[PDB]
């Protein structure tokens, strides 16, 4: 599976625009894609850790926010 390819160039442009970026090099989409996958992986990894510490199979929004405090 490559679903990091599904997060879209226009999406990245949009996000960029909000960060106040005026102009963008071509390699930004792969970098951004990778940067995101790393970040996402950290939070999900940390998050499931709270989920099995409570002995659950289901990730609550609670798991996710506690994990973000670690980041």
């Amino acid at each position: 599976r490559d679903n990091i390819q599904g997060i879209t160039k226009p999406a990245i442009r949009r996000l960029a625009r909000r960060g106040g970026v005026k102009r963008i090099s071509g390699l930004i989409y792969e970098e951004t894609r990778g940067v995101l996958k790393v970040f996402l992986e950290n939070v999900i990894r940390d998050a499931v850790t709270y989920t099995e510490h409570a002995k659950r199979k289901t990730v609550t929004a609670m798991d996710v926010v506690y994990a973000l405090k670690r980041q």
Binding site: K9, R13, A16, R23, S25, G26
Partner: protein, 271 residues
């Protein structure tokens, strides 16, 4: 050092490559041109008539930088002897083509265009390379860097990506380029290696003690071990220290008394 004369032949076999910029330049304008492989050398045909020759027996290292992860694709030539064109003498001559573009603030069909040029360019380059290697009886070879062994550092007061090849530590995508022949290295010594430091400098000392040490600055600690592992696979010894050392003073001291330096136990002072 004077060169030999380019031997050019008129015939069916003339591997050529179009759409190539030449670093460094012949003016303050970028001279585009074409590169041609003749019997004993390389001819570069510029649009403006400016022509530069490079001899296969003058090539110290021949580098091929593909376009993967990059905005360009490069042929790099590290020369045994500096050759003169323009004002200065140049040990490093290379040829590149640009593959990438700049958006201002979803186009699909145009992305097929993208990968196809990237595919053309790098097929163009491989097919040329495969010829030239064959014309010399594999006696001249293009070394392609190992990107898995890469690391980021600041030799030149920019942060670039340095990559090992078989014979060299290399960056061909930034000008001035960075080429270091591994066979010529006495040892590596890492400085500012200590806990709570996110960056270390790496010091390259040459077998030829007259040559000033080459620094690679501000490399992330995470890369310290991968690098060490590579250094061993090269039989390049290394050492560590917290403090930054004065190498022009150390090299001065050694070159001025190469004998008594090895009476102290030599490089053991690095521990």
């Amino acid at each position: 050092v004077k060169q030999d004369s380019l031997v050019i032949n008129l015939n069916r076999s003339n591997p050529k490559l179009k759409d190539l910029y030449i670093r460094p330049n012949i003016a303050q304008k970028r001279m585009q041109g074409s590169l041609e492989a003749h019997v004993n050398g390389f001819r570069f045909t510029s649009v403006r008539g400016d022509k530069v020759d490079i001899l296969y027996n003058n090539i110290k290292h021949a580098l091929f930088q593909p376009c993967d992860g990059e905005m360009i694709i490069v042929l790099h030539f590290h020369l045994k002897n500096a050759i003169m064109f323009g004002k200065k003498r140049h040990t490093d001559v290379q040829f590149y083509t640009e593959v990438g573009e700049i958006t201002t603030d979803d186009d699909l069909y145009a992305e097929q265009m993208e990968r196809e040029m990237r595919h053309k360019l790098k097929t163009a380059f491989k097919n040329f390379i495969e010829k030239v290697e064959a014309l010399t009886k594999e006696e001249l070879e293009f070394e392609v860097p190992f990107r898995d062994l890469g690391f980021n550092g600041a030799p030149y007061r920019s942060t670039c990506l340095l990559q090992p090849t078989s014979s060299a530590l290399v960056n061909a995508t930034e000008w001035p380029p960075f080429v270091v022949t591994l066979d010529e290295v006495e040892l590596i010594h890492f400085e500012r290696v200590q806990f709570h430091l996110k960056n270390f400098d790496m010091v390259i000392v040459y077998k030829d003690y007259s040559k000033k040490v080459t620094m690679i600055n501000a490399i992330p600690v995470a890369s310290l071990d991968p690098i060490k592992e590579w250094l061993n696979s090269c039989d390049l010894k290394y050492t560590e220290g917290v403090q930054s050392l004065n190498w022009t003073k150390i090299m001065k001291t050694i070159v001025d008394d190469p004998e008594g330096f090895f009476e102290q136990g030599g490089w053991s002072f690095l521990e």
